[PDB]
């Protein structure tokens, strides 16, 4: 019927002025563009079919051709950036926005999907979709008393498209658009569907990946407790974006970090810092490193939750990137901590793994470790116990590593190692 048509036949059917022949040719095009392997998007574009599809988007009296052309254009916009640009150049954005209010739910859902692709191309097309006025009808589609009355696929598509509207930087989405979207996004963040939750968390993570004002916009909506709850979820697709959002939030001010701590986030990190998935471990260690860069009371809350031994463990054995994040966490801890917190750090057994990591090839981690060791030595000086720390470092084999680094190619490593050896060894 409409299966395995040639682009020639599709073009002849769409060039006929018989709306039913046009409909069947458009369905054949949709079926070609929906094939698993190498859909012929470039050939369809070269045939000049995008303007015809966009015109078909406005055939209110023929809902089937609206649906077929919307699907075809969605799949074309899912290709390269040049093909999404081809779709946009045909005028598809306002037509899809007009279709958002279609009485046919499948047509509205397809329009949502297409706008999601277009906005997902990048920040320019994201802002252009916003300028054409998509947010208001999109949100109207979600203005229901209970989200559970909506079809699951429809709701997932709406959530994904909104997340794409929140995505990308340079520039970030317009502030007014973010404020207009956020309430619905929180409501979705409280939904029970795992995919909706994952996409909502990803959107919140996008919105929190920026200056402190952007983070404040999100945290004032009260999302942090729900984010922590989702941090404790069993589904990795939910935990990953929730952890990303929590990390972004703790990159902000001390009060936003304190909001994260007050919600009970630290109690989840014993599992996260031992999670079998390496990415979770790395992101959790980065989050901990940003939390140890906070106030001394926040470092003390890290201590009270028994998380210093977990940092020692990650420093002892983990993928090298997680170990680098842990070294950063240790250096921030030692930079901002009290003498008592630093001696507690040493009592947990940090010196030996911190020294074993001086074997690495990365220069920046070496500099970070040497800075942490200098801070720990300053604490030991204030206690008059420099010789005990030096004996510890010498027994570990760390003095060998430091004296070797005296001959390192980088200037800072050279000078830091020589300072340590001149002042304490």
């Amino acid at each position: 019927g409409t299966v395995n048509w040639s682009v020639e036949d599709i073009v002849k059917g769409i060039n006929s002025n018989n709306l039913e022949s046009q409909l069947q040719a458009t369905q054949a095009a949709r079926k070609l563009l929906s094939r698993e392997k190498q859909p012929p998007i470039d050939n369809i574009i070269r045939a000049g079919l995008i303007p015809k599809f966009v015109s078909f988007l406005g055939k209110t009296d023929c809902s089937p051709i609206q649906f077929e052309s919307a699907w075809a254009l969605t799949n074309i916009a899912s290709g390269t950036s040049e093909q999404t640009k081809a779709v946009v150049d045909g005028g598809a954005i306002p037509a899809f926005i007009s279709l958002l209010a279609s009485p046919h739910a499948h047509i509205s859902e397809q329009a949502v999907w297409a706008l999601g692709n277009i906005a997902g191309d990048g920040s320019a097309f994201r802002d252009l979709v916003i300028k054409h006025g998509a947010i208001d009808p999109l949100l109207a589609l979600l203005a229901v008393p209970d989200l559970s009355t909506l079809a699951c696929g429809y709701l997932r598509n709406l959530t994904w498209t909104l997340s794409n509207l929140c995505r990308n930087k340079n520039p970030a989405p317009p502030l007014d658009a973010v404020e207009q979207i956020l309430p619905t996004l929180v409501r979705l963040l409280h939904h029970n569907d795992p995919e909706v939750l994952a996409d909502s968390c990803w959107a919140i993570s996008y919105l929190t990946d920026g200056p402190n004002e952007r983070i404040e916009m999100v945290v004032k909506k009260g999302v942090v407790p729900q984010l922590v709850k989702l941090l404790g979820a069993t589904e990795l697709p939910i935990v990953t974006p929730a952890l990303r959002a929590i990390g972004n939030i703790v990159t902000g001010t001390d009060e936003q970090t304190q909001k994260v701590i007050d919600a009970g986030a630290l109690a989840v990190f014993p599992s996260l810092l031992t999670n079998p998935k390496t990415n979770i471990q790395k992101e959790a260690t980065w989050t901990m490193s940003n939390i140890t860069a906070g106030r001394q009371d926040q470092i003390q809350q890290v201590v009270n939750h028994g998380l210093v031994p977990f940092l020692v463990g990650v420093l002892s054995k983990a993928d090298f990137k997680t170990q680098k994040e842990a070294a950063w966490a240790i250096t921030n801890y030692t930079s901002g901590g009290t003498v008592e917190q630093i001696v507690y750090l040493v009592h947990c057994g940090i010196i030996e793994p911190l020294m074993n990591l001086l074997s690495a090839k990365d220069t920046k981690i070496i500099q970070v470790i040497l800075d942490a060791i200098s801070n720990i030595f300053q604490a030991a000086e204030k206690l008059g116990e420099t010789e005990k720390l030096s004996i510890m470092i010498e027994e570990c084999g760390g003095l060998d590593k430091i004296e070797a680094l005296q001959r390192h190619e980088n200037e800072s490593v050279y000078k830091a190692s020589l300072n340590l050896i001149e002042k304490y060894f």
Binding site: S34, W71, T74, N75, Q110, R167, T251, G252, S289, T292
Partner: peptide, 19 residues
């Protein structure tokens, strides 16, 4: 000690095809 922001994503485009 300064807060260290997350590294930029290398996934610049997020688009989906309907099969």
């Amino acid at each position: 000690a300064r807060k260290r922001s997350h590294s930029p994503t290398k996934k610049l485009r997020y688009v989906k095809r309907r099969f």
